[PDB]
Design an enzyme around this catalytic site. Structure first.
Site, PDB file in Angstrom:
ATOM      1  NE  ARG A  54      -9.862 -24.051  -1.247  1.00  0.00           N
ATOM      2  CZ  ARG A  54      -8.928 -24.374  -0.898  1.00  0.00           C
ATOM      3  NH1 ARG A  54      -7.960 -24.203  -1.897  1.00  0.00           N
ATOM      4  NH2 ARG A  54      -8.359 -25.124   0.716  1.00  0.00           N
ATOM      5  CG  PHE A  59      -5.185 -21.917   4.769  1.00  0.00           C
ATOM      6  CD1 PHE A  59      -3.721 -21.792   4.416  1.00  0.00           C
ATOM      7  CD2 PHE A  59      -6.030 -23.137   3.871  1.00  0.00           C
ATOM      8  CE1 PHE A  59      -2.909 -22.666   4.046  1.00  0.00           C
ATOM      9  CE2 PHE A  59      -5.262 -23.977   2.901  1.00  0.00           C
ATOM     10  CZ  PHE A  59      -4.007 -23.366   2.844  1.00  0.00           C
ATOM     11  CD  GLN A  62      -7.243 -21.774  -4.457  1.00  0.00           C
ATOM     12  OE1 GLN A  62      -7.058 -22.528  -3.100  1.00  0.00           O
ATOM     13  NE2 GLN A  62      -7.357 -21.874  -5.788  1.00  0.00           N
ATOM     14  CG  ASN A 101       0.531 -26.388  -7.208  1.00  0.00           C
ATOM     15  OD1 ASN A 101       0.129 -27.832  -6.393  1.00  0.00           O
ATOM     16  ND2 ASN A 101       1.616 -26.615  -6.230  1.00  0.00           N
ATOM     17  CG  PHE A 112      -2.349 -19.437  -1.914  1.00  0.00           C
ATOM     18  CD1 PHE A 112      -2.039 -20.738  -3.428  1.00  0.00           C
ATOM     19  CD2 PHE A 112      -1.947 -19.246  -1.091  1.00  0.00           C
ATOM     20  CE1 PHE A 112      -0.692 -21.356  -2.550  1.00  0.00           C
ATOM     21  CE2 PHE A 112      -0.896 -20.554  -0.450  1.00  0.00           C
ATOM     22  CZ  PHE A 112      -0.133 -21.338  -1.005  1.00  0.00           C
ATOM     23  CG  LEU A 121       0.570 -24.574   1.886  1.00  0.00           C
ATOM     24  CD1 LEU A 121       0.372 -23.020   1.470  1.00  0.00           C
ATOM     25  CD2 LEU A 121       0.302 -25.341   1.410  1.00  0.00           C
ATOM     26  CG  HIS A 125       1.186 -24.522  -2.763  1.00  0.00           C
ATOM     27  ND1 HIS A 125       0.182 -24.269  -4.016  1.00  0.00           N
ATOM     28  CD2 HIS A 125       1.245 -25.300  -1.984  1.00  0.00           C
ATOM     29  CE1 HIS A 125      -0.804 -25.378  -3.562  1.00  0.00           C
ATOM     30  NE2 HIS A 125      -0.286 -26.136  -2.463  1.00  0.00           N
TER      31      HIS A 125
END
Lengths: 164, 146
Positions: A54, A59, A62, A101, A112, A121, A125
């Site tokens: 991903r 951004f 991942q 998660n 990531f 975030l 995370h």
């Protein structure tokens, strides 16, 4: 002095470059130990051969789902999952390494690498490290992403382990 | 319901009290006979899951039937989760978490997340999916009423 791990990244089988990470084991020792052990493949499973499934430009990238390879899988060296150790470190910019998660206390193997400042975030995370060398490789991985995360080429961890 | 405004986009509007009342009146006269199923489906166009639960929670009596219904919705929610395993995050700005069963039925999702799914592009049609579940539930409980 903090443990150091490396990834050799490849795209459709061909070398791209090595990325290296400092892991902040003083601040989050269990989360850093999970990622290091998975990177050496010393408990007989880990990151070697798996994919960044991903990638979302501007951004993050991942990866780490070595069981199911699409984000629905993964496991830690402590069992299925482990708790959020703390959120002392924050998402302050590019190169930050953090745990993907499915909600609080569901850390497994997925992680990531941030390609921007991801403030929202914070506290969701666990941040456990940062890219030390080879941010150009992660900037070159971005190219192969898309707005929904699907990649146009297989981005794989061809090899990995511990430098320091 | 979700509807289009003068400027192009889909936007939330509150459920009409007249719709609700029509539904209430259909149940009073017909109970849960077959003919109510097409009525429900007509009266619930573009409904959010919160709208759908308002319609269901207005029915007086038929408690046996309403529990049956809830149990059927609950089976479909569990089956949705069985077939749509969660994907680990983080959530990109502009994106939304993937709906769980409980979310589609309105139990764990707020109206703003429901609007969020139903107006995304491509849309996750949580209204239409929940309505399908409800209509299956109605097709079961109408056995008690021939």
């Amino acid at each position: 002095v903090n443990p150091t791990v490396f990834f050799d990244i490849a795209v459709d089988g061909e070398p791209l470059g090595r990325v290296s990470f400092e892991l902040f084991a003083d601040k989050v020792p269990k989360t850093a130990e999970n990622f290091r052990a998975l990177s050496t493949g010393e408990k007989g499973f880990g990151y070697k051969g798996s994919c960044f499934h991903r990638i979302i430009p501007g951004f993050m990238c991942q990866g780490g789902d070595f069981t199911r390879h699409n984000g629905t899988g993964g496991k830690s060296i402590y069992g299925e999952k482990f708790e959020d150790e703390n959120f002392i470190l924050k998402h302050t910019g590019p190169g930050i390494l953090s745990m993907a998660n499915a909600g609080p206390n569901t850390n497994g193997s997925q992680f990531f690498i941030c390609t921007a400042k991801t403030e929202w975030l914070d506290g969701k995370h666990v941040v456990f490290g940062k890219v030390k060398e080879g941010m150009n490789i992660v900037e070159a991985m971005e190219r192969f992403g898309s707005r929904n995360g699907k990649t146009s080429k297989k981005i794989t961890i061809a090899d990995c382990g511990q430098l320091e | 319901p979700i509807v289009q405004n003068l400027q192009g986009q889909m936007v939330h509007q509150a459920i009409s009290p007249r719709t609700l009342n029509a539904w209430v009146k259909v149940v009073e006269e017909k109970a849960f006979s077959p003919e109510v199923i097409p009525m429900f489906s007509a009266l619930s166009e573009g409904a959010t899951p919160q709208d759908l639960n308002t319609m269901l929670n207005t029915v007086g009596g038929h408690q046996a039937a309403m529990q049956m219904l809830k149990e059927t919705i609950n089976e479909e929610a569990a089956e949705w989760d069985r077939l749509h395993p969660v994907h680990a995050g983080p959530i990109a700005p502009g994106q939304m978490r993937e709906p769980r069963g409980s979310d589609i039925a309105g139990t764990t999702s707020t109206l703003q997340e429901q609007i969020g799914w139903m107006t995304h592009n491509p849309p996750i049609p949580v209204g239409e999916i929940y309505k399908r579940w409800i209509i299956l539930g109605l097709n079961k409980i109408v056995r008690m009423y021939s």
